[PDB]
Amino acid sequence: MDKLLERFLHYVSLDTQSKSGVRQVPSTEGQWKLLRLLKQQLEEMGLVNITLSEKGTLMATLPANVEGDIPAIGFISHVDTSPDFSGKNVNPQIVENYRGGDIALGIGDEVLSPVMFPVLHQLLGQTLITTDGKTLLGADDKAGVAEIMTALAVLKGNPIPHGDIKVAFTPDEEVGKGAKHFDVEAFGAQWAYTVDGGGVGELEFENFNAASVNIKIVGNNVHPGTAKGVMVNALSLAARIHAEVPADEAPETTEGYEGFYHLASMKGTVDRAEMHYIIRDFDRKQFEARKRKMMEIAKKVGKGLHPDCYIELVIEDSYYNMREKVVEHPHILDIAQQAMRDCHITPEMKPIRGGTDGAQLSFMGLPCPNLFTGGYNYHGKHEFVTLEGMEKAVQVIVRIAELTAKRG
Amino acid sequence: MDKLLERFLHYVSLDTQSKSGVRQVPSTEGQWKLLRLLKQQLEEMGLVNITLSEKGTLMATLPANVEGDIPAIGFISHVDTSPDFSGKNVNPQIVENYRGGDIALGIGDEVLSPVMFPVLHQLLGQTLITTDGKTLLGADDKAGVAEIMTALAVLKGNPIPHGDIKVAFTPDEEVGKGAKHFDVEAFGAQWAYTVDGGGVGELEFENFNAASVNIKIVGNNVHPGTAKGVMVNALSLAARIHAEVPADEAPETTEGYEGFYHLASMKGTVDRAEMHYIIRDFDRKQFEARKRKMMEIAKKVGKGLHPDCYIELVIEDSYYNMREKVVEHPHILDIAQQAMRDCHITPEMKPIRGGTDGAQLSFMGLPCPNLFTGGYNYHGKHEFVTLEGMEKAVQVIVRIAELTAKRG
Ligand SMILES: [Zn+2]
Ligand SMILES: [Zn+2]
Ligand SMILES: [Zn+2]
Ligand SMILES: [Zn+2]
């Protein structure tokens, strides 16, 4: 199981940052750089049916080790790094046998601190890989790419029985295009896992049901000095709508399993205004309830307006909670959990307050929970990872593949 | 008193529309076209000390008719037409002996209607001048320019005693630059009147005290799924501020002498938001009270925010109510009122729910109330005027000049 570190740093050195609002997929050339590198490494490795689509999705198959009717399983990672910070000229910082202090990031006033991140006191003794403080690290999701790549080297070069293993590396996960052009048919996996989770132990199979609620408000402007009973202030309606939305059921005041309404943005004048709301909820019923609530709030404020003044709502479903799709087949989480115990890891299962490409794929015919990576503080300069956590991800992937063949 | 109509139509044919947010004054070439025309006509008329500044303000003096120590008075009109509708290729429509029906504007579905404008039933018998329905008319303020120009022809060509009469024609009244570069010193008028009012009888000397209140809100954005006790939604603060502003004390619900708060515009995201409020009030005390109220409302919402999240208010005074400046010298309104009675007109004195260049000049050393013009429905395609009302404006101006010399 060597070259884990090497593969990781190699991938980290490549600028693969994604770009919002681009029509082309992948959105940036850098991503094609890493995809081509992976493609070559897969060929050299000896995988079969390797293919890189025009949309930049890399697929490949490691054939069964043994005979028997074993279901093919898959592992998926995404190639791009967050637009929220640069993954440009990352300069990794390796801290062997971390003793628990503050980590200086590069030369300057930048620090990885256990005061700010208590998790560190949970990683005494390990090798930490950090940034110089001037960029992202890319652990998300290049540690996953490295771990999958590594798990394949281990499966191919050791006496470990396994069925067919499908792997994929996708392009614009960060900008929401991760599963858009995913050819589940070509992939040919009975089920899969994304290796795009957090710390050691993380296993996720529950995510938010999501929807956007756009509101278009048309008022009536006129010179203010003579607006009596004539002027319809659109912003006054916007404020009245938001006044009715539960301030206790908002991102700033929810945690764990509680849903919410959130006003992302709003802009307007007396004549027109627009609001962009989002609704998140683990429960499909309370998700519906949440749409109703908004429409209801709207009606209220839309009391009696001179039929040239209205309030329109446009509700768009973004994604659903996989729970149902995953739990529907017990072996998926059972194998993953048994695999972690076999590797002396305590499975930690927290719900995802957001979504994942796995949740999209789970509705496209590929139930697909999330596996940990060992990385932390995902989108900023405080992002870091530990080699041991990365080696455990490898161990788990390899065990899951062995266990799957065992039962097949 | 001829060429009133002719001068009017001539001026109406010139595109003199102003333009918002231009640094140059006048903001448009068309205005210089009318200013040059007026300049020439003043020369031909025989006025003295005629001058056109680099900023496009035209001044001129008609010397005293008689001797005695008579105070010089002035008459002011503005040359540009509203940006709110085109004053491009105006095609006037003349309706002699209006009998009270609906007036068809040009060829098409456009109408001047007494149902929509009850004033018409107050103008039976008169000659109406309307638009074709495709533009503004320009009565505001080209009727005033014509009336002043005409009043001067009458004063110069008839046995009517008068002291010195100063006249001025200003450039960007519509875009707020009307009195900016007004050289009151060069003008040399003890007091003046703007001929920029409405229907026959109108005399205005009270206007709003005005101020803008800008609010900058800095919040704290973070991915929503993990914003608990961390995310500070700036829009939520904006809505909470506007929630505290009196919906009964707003443009849509005030009239006559009642002040108000008005939210002109607002834009924002979770990280930042901005609000542009205006405050209008005839009373200087309640104007102050209104500033206090806003600052107060702000404090409340600014409760306890992590010192990286704040709410800043920036209050800018725009203009004041002239009342004080005008009433301070009784002859100004006394002469104007006596003049209207001498002309068999009932003086109508309503407060201006907004401001005028006269109110700005009144604080620059030139008390300056507003005189009627006979025009109605100022900024749209439904703008119209009546020749009789225009002739009365002329009569009043001429009488005011005669009365002023009488008492001097
Ligand atoms: Zn991410
Ligand atoms: Zn990721
Ligand atoms: Zn106007
Ligand atoms: Zn005007």
Side-chain angles (χ1 to χ4, degrees), chain B residues 76-93:
Chain B
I76 301 158
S77 264
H78 69 75
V79 139
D80 63 308
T81 49
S82 199
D84 301 346
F85 207 90
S86 99
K88 173 73 166 190
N89 290 301
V90 188
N91 300 303
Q93 238 176 57

Side-chain angles (χ1 to χ4, degrees), chain A residues 1-12 34 38 41 45 77-78 138-139 141-153 169 195 373 390 393-394 397:
Chain A
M1 188 226 276
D2 290 291
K3 304 203 174 166
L4 207 204
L5 218 196
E6 170 172 46
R7 288 193 183 87
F8 180 71
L9 303 174
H10 190 350
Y11 307 154
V12 173
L34 179 46
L38 294 173
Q41 299 181 324
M45 207 154 283
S77 264
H78 69 75
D141 189 19
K142 278 154 189 189
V145 175
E147 280 141 25
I148 294 176
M149 225 51 196
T150 301
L152 288 175
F169 307 103
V195 184
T373 286
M390 287 193 69
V394 167
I397 293 173

Side-chain angles (χ1 to χ4, degrees), chain B residues 78 140-141 173-174 196:
Chain B
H78 69 75
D140 170 15
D141 189 19
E173 192 289 321
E174 294 305 8
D196 189 34

Side-chain angles (χ1 to χ4, degrees), chain A residues 43-95:
Chain A
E43 323 234 297
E44 304 158 24
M45 207 154 283
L47 296 228
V48 149
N49 296 320
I50 306 173
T51 65
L52 220 199
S53 66
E54 294 189 297
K55 292 304 157 178
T57 291
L58 220 200
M59 307 204 315
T61 301
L62 201 237
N65 224 16
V66 297
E67 234 317 302
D69 187 2
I70 311 168
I73 55 178
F75 295 94
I76 301 158
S77 264
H78 69 75
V79 139
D80 63 308
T81 49
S82 199
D84 301 346
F85 207 90
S86 99
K88 173 73 166 190
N89 290 301
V90 188
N91 300 303
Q93 238 176 57
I94 291 160
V95 188

Side-chain angles (χ1 to χ4, degrees), chain A residues 140 173-174 379:
Chain A
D140 170 15
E173 192 289 321
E174 294 305 8
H379 291 158

Side-chain angles (χ1 to χ4, degrees), chain A residues 225 228 231 252 254 267, chain B residues 225 228 231 252 254 267 353:
Chain A
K228 232 281 212 302
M231 183 195 121
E252 320 85 85
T254 45
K267 205 221 308 181
Chain B
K228 232 281 212 302
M231 183 195 121
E252 320 85 85
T254 45
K267 205 221 308 181
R353 294 211 122 214

Side-chain angles (χ1 to χ4, degrees), chain B residues 268-305 307-336:
Chain B
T269 53
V270 178
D271 48 281
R272 274 191 173 195
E274 72 199 5
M275 313 175 95
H276 305 275
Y277 273 98
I278 59 173
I279 280 175
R280 300 282 100 107
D281 198 278
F282 295 103
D283 194 275
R284 190 62 75 89
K285 277 194 64 177
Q286 314 304 168
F287 172 71
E288 288 314 78
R290 283 188 149 77
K291 296 185 194 299
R292 311 292 172 185
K293 220 297 169 306
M294 291 303 302
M295 303 178 265
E296 271 168 36
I297 283 178
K299 271 216 169 175
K300 233 203 183 314
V301 192
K303 168 230 171 179
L305 307 167
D308 305 73
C309 293
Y310 54 102
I311 306 179
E312 261 166 32
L313 288 248
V314 169
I315 307 189
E316 231 183 305
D317 277 339
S318 311
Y319 55 81
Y320 308 117
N321 186 349
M322 353 165 211
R323 201 181 178 283
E324 113 204 12
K325 296 299 187 175
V326 175
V327 171
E328 201 185 311
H329 312 91
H331 48 290
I332 304 178
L333 294 166
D334 291 325
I335 294 183

